[PDB]
Structures are given as structure tokens and as C-alpha cells.
Description:
- This is part of a larger assembly, with 2 copies of chain A and 1 copy of chain C.
- Chain A is an alpha+beta fold.
- In chain A, 41% of the residues lie in helices and 18% in strands.
- Chain A has 16 helices and 17 strands.
- A 6-stranded mixed sheet of chain A has the order 3-2-1-9-10-17, with helices on both faces.
- In chain A, helix 5 (182-196) crosses helix 6.
- Chain A starts with 7 loop residues before the first strand and ends with a helix.
- Helix content of chain C is 95%, strand content 0%.
- Chain C has 1 helix and no strands.
- Chain C is rod-shaped, with a radius of gyration of 17 Å.
- Chain A binds chain B through residues 73-75, 110-114, 171-174, 176-179, 265, 268-271, 368, and chain B through 39-40, 66-67, 191, 194-197, 199, 201-204, 231, 266-269.
- The structure holds adenosine-5'-diphosphate (2 copies) and magnesium ion (MG) (2 copies).
Amino acid sequence: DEDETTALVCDNGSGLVKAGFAGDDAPRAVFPSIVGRPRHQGVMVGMGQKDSYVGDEAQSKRGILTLKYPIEHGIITNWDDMEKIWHHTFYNELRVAPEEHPTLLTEAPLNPKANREKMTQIMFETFNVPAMYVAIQAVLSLYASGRTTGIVLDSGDGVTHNVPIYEGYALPHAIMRLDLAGRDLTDYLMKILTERGYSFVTTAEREIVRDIKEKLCYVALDFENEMATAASSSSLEKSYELPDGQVITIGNERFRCPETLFQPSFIGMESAGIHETTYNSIMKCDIDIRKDLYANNVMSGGTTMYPGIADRMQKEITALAPSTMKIKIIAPPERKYSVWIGGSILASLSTFQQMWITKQEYDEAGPSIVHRKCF
Amino acid sequence: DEDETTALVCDNGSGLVKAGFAGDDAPRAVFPSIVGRPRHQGVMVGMGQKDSYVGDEAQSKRGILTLKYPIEHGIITNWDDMEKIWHHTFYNELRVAPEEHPTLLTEAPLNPKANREKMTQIMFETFNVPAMYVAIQAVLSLYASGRTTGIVLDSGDGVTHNVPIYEGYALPHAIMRLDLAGRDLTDYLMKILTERGYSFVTTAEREIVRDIKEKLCYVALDFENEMATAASSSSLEKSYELPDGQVITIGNERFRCPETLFQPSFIGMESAGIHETTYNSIMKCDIDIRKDLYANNVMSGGTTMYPGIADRMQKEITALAPSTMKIKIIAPPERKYSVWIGGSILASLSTFQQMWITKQEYDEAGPSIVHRKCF
Amino acid sequence: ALDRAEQAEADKKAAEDRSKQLEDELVSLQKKLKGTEDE
Ligand SMILES: Nc1ncnc2c1ncn2[C@@H]1O[C@H](COP(=O)(O)OP(=O)(O)O)[C@@H](O)[C@H]1O
Ligand SMILES: Nc1ncnc2c1ncn2[C@@H]1O[C@H](COP(=O)(O)OP(=O)(O)O)[C@@H](O)[C@H]1O
Ligand SMILES: [Mg+2]
Ligand SMILES: [Mg+2]
């Protein structure tokens, strides 16, 4: 299927795995990060004895399979799910073995050392891979953006990373990760819908309402004013049609769901909102480059697909920062895949072909030394 | 409770307020500098309507109250917290009114004029105090040390001051403040523990790990060699028992946490380490007295309670300065309270009773003139 | 019985914390004494 000896770019982002060959502009195999496991034991004869579903095979059946998240906040919980999702991506979709081409994986900023050593060991010992490389997502996203300056805000599913890069330089000190993202928003919407009257307590409905949020939920331009005008609703409340057919009616809750990002007090945490944390990060940077960080801020992550985030960011930053300079916020189209896109354009360089880590040096050095070599 | 008309020594140091009457050898009321504010709104009936907790009342409950620091880097952020902590210290612990005795407060070197004018105004207009006085911490610490020569290194919680005093002579031009202290060390330990695997993002855990650091974290005598020998750990890693019961295992991170003081590059700041900044300060002084500053260097601040700071300072200064002279470093026992102790022995002199500032002259002159009179 | 057990356990925890603090202070003091003797 592939006639070019190039690394397979597999972005294992929290919530959605995006795998594809280098050189492509979009991932071909896109599936959620979920593992379905047979709950009961059947006396039936003939069905697949497979004890571990994955991807679309699990999405197609969520009532029988208990759903487990292979990644939580960033820390890898179960490694069997890791081996399952890579083995599946290798021998069920791509139809190619890892013994013929490299593999450029993308990991989140500020992750545990155990996670890195574990994935590297599974990719070297178990699977025969000629070479591995771990890369931070923020750099590849800035590559795909086509710039060298700005602060990347990557909001995945269970973690949110703010990474400032000015003039093409990393700042490992200022990267601050906060576990507020799509899962805590799904939980907030679920508890407020339970407050509305429709109560559910199973994961399949949680994924359904997550999809409903992805499709409908947006960000408000003025929270309190929308609350007041929605008190007497007319066009502000919408009636959604569940894929099963049950008629759901959702009004203001939509534009109050992502608001939890701006007010973490809703989930009883002393952490500051994403905008205030980004602002504090800007103060932690130097003054000289702060204006450039204001003018080149970039966004990444699937959570940014909601309509109305750019305007909300502009008003909040204008209210926090002075209103004398110019603070333009740029969001490139299809930003979610941009990271993966970067991977593709990063795997075609010959120099990058010279910066890989082969098996033998890793085996003698050991995983810890490999951690030192990368950074 | 008090039968002597003597000033109340209230050291409002960053991180810990230490209040007590003059003449005593240690502060009786010692509580952290924190303000707990009710996060949610309760429908319950009967609980205290008090809207602002302080001190031990806030320490006892950190899960319900969002914690705010009343002092940051040195600059006073919120004045309501100031009024709260003084009113509390006056009408909840000491059980004495400020209308009967003076008050000798201690402020940090090189502080804003707004801070001084604000505290003086709250201490004159609002509260009826017969007389106020602002004092620098370094002089009182040198008093308690029982000498007149040396360079005082006061490392509080959010600021670190290096103050050279030779023959009792202050040098306002050489005092250089740098905002590297216990909070940036707590942040570094937190991010590296998040790197280890245990991730938290709330202030209560931050205070808990701060206490864990105060109890366990020490300074290394040789960073790289300890790194090498800790690669294969045995007795170098310790298993701590959280007050809640969760078994934490912390190894090298301990003696790498305060190392950020010696290598500010970890937090991406061009500032120099505390030892190098002190060395540069010594070059800024005159050569004649430099040897005396080498032989009489004194330390102050709670951050100095870690074991192994004296030896690390000696090796670093010996590596930086020549090794021909004698460079003895002296650290008096219970140095943290020494400052406060000084206050006590400073409030008993009759001459000091003649150097106070009464209400009437301040009222006619105004606060700015009061600033000129002090210095 | 459980109340007395919990009280005794609290007292034991306090005593053991004090003992461990004293042991840490003692080993640090021994190191300082060794250094002073070398000097
Ligand atoms: N099309 C979409 N619309 C709205 N939200 C989305 C969409 N796709 C993903 N998300 C949200 O983004 C999160 C996953 O993001 P992720 O795939 O990790 O981004 P990236 O791959 O850029 O790191 C989930 O919480 C999900 O709710
Ligand atoms: N017993 C202790 N052990 C270790 N560190 C301490 C201790 N007490 C205070 N500290 C540290 O000192 C800082 C506060 O110092 P501070 O009370 O301002 O000193 P001072 O009162 O001498 O100015 C905090 O960052 C805290 O972590
Ligand atoms: Mg993302
Ligand atoms: Mg201090």
C-alpha cells in the first residue's frame, strides 16, 4: 500500500487517535480512544472469542461493552489498552508492519517518565521497530501554523497545555498543564442535565452527550446577559433530536457548559480559568516578548472546534490586559489535525531522518539514557 | 494580660505571621499568611456567617475555602486581607487593643511606597494607635545575631533579600531583591512530581507538599554525583506517609528541589543563583571590607531551615572566590525567629521609645512626609 | 474499646513522629560534628 520508506505519523491524542502515513494532509484512521470489554459471559457459540474491542468496533457496540478510557488527565492508566490500540492500528487499518518504516509519535507536554519509558519499551522490545522518536505536540502545531512565535493552547480531552514559543524557542519552565478539558465539561453538562430532569449514569449516554456537545454547544459572548435574555427563551432554546429519537430540549445549558473553563469554581477547584492561567503565564514570560505573544497566540486541540472561542478570548484578554496595543488572535483552519499535519512535514526532512534513535544504542544505553538524549 | 506599656512586635513575614509582645524570646501567635474565602453558597442555617477566615481557622479547613496569598513577591495584592490579619491578631489571639501600647512592625527591604503608605494609613486612621514605626528586617536580624558586620541573606517565601552591613553600616544601594524563594520551589517540586506521576492542581495539596518539603527536602552536597548514585537508589529514596495515609515515594527530587535556587535556568529566568548574586554583590562592595563580609555572612528566613545549606554555601563560595583566605559562614540557632527576637530587644530601649511617630505629626505632615522622615 | 484504641493510636503516632524528628536531628548533628572535627 505504501511504496515510500517514511515514518508512520500516529498522533495518540487523548480522546481521538489519528494515524496516517507521512506526507498526507489528514489522518486516514481516526477513531476515539476507548476500549470496550465484554461485561458478561455468554453461553452462545460462534461469536468472536476476541476479549478486547477497540476503536470503531467498540463504538458500534457500547451497550454490551463496559467502556474504559486508556488515558486519564495524561497519565497512562492501563498499558494493555496501549498495546491493543497500537496492535489494532498496525494490523487492522494501515495493513503495514512497523518492521519496515519508522514511527514518529506525538506525546503531551510534561508527561510522566514512566509513560515514556513504557511506550518506548513496548515499541522496541515487543515490536521490532527500526527507530522511534518522541515529540511534543506544541512544536508540531506551531510548525503546521507556519510561524515561529506565539503561545499554543492545546485543549485535548482530559488535559490542557499552554506552551509559549517565541522566535522558535521552547520554554520548558513556563509550560503549565491543567486537567480541565472535554471530560470535565461532559461531567458538568451531565450533572446540570440531571438537574434539568433527564438523569443518566452510564458511559454510553456520556459519550452521546459528548457528541451532542461537540455538535451544538458553543461559547457565550456575554454570560450574564445571555442568562437574563434566556430567562424568557424563544430562539435561545433549541430542541435536539437524539439519534435514538427521544426529543431532548436544551436551552441555555449549551453556552454555560464550556463556561466552566472560565470559572473552575463550578467544579470546586482553586485553579484559575484557562484565560487567567494563560494571562499569568504571559506575566511569567519576559516583558519584551509579551506583545509578540499577544499578537501570535495559537490554539490547538479538538475542544477548540466550538464556535465563539476566539471572540470570548479577545474580550477576556482585552478586559485583563491594556487596550492600547493590538491583540490579534489567530486560529488556523482545521487546527485539530494541524498537529498531525506537522508530523507529516516533519518526517520528510533528511535531517530528521538523521535524528532517529535506533534499537542497538537504546539497548546498550537503556531507556533512562534515551530520556537524557532527547532532553 | 500585659502589665507593661511596651510595643507589640508583629513580624508580618511572607508565609508566616509571628506576633508577640516585646521582651519575649519567641512569637506566641505563629500562623501562616493565608486567607480562606467561602467558595460556594450554603442553604444551611446556624453556621458562622463570617465571610473571611484567617490563620489556623483557615488551615483547619482548606477543602472548602479557596486560598489566597495576601502577599506576592513582596507587593501587597489585597488590603482587605491585611486588615483581616491585623484585626484577627488583635481581637482573637493577643486579647489586647492597639490603643494602649505601640507597635513595631517589620517590613521587607526595597518595598513599594504604596505598601508603606497604605499600612501606615490603616494603622493611624482606622485603628487608633498612639505610635507606629517601620523597620527593615535585616537590621533586626543582625541585632539578634549579636554582631555589627556581615551580609544578611533573608530568604522568605516569595522574595529573597541580600543585605550587606559592615560595622553596623547599611548599604541601600547594594540591596538587591530577587523573587526566588519557597513558592517557586514548591512550584518546581509540584511540576516535577507531576512528572513523576502524581498530578494535582489545587492549592491545598500545594500547601501539603510545601509542608512535606519543609520536613524532608534538603540541599545536596554534590548535585551530579548524587544524581549518578541515585540512578540506582537504595537508601537514597525514601517512602513518606502522607497525613491522609496515601503512600508517597520520593527519591532524588528532594535534593533537586532547592537546587533551582542555584540554577534559575530551570524556571527560564536570566537571573543568577542566590550564591552567584551574593558573590556579585560582594564585588559591588569595596575590596577593603570584602574579607569581613566573607567572614561574617549571616542567614535569615524560614527557608534556611533545610539541612545542608551551610556546606553548600561554603563549597560554592570557595569554588567562586580564592581559597587562600578564611571564609567562615555562621548560622545562629533558631535564626528564623531571630528577626522577631531583635524586635523585642529593640522595643525595650528608652531611646527607641523616643524615636516613635505619633498621630498628630503624621496627620499634619501626611504619609509622604513620614516616608521622608524615616529615610 | 475502639475509642481507647484510637486514643492510644493517636498518642503513639505523636510519639513516633517526635522520635523520628529527634533521630533526623541527631544524624544531622552527627554529620555537623564530623565536619567540625575535620575543620
Ligand atoms: N469536531 C469536534 N467538535 C467539538 N469538539 C471536539 C471535536 N473533535 C474533538 N473534540 C473534543 O476535543 C477533545 C479531544 O481532542 P484531541 O483529539 O486530543 O485534540 P488533538 O488531537 O488536537 O490533541 C475531546 O474532549 C472532544 O470533546
Ligand atoms: N520549619 C521550617 N522548615 C523549612 N522551611 C520553612 C520552615 N518554616 C518556614 N519555612 C519556609 O520559609 C518561608 C517563609 O519564611 P518567613 O516566615 O518569611 O521567614 P522570616 O519570618 O524569617 O522572614 C516559606 O517558604 C517556608 O517554606
Ligand atoms: Mg489537543
Ligand atoms: Mg525571611
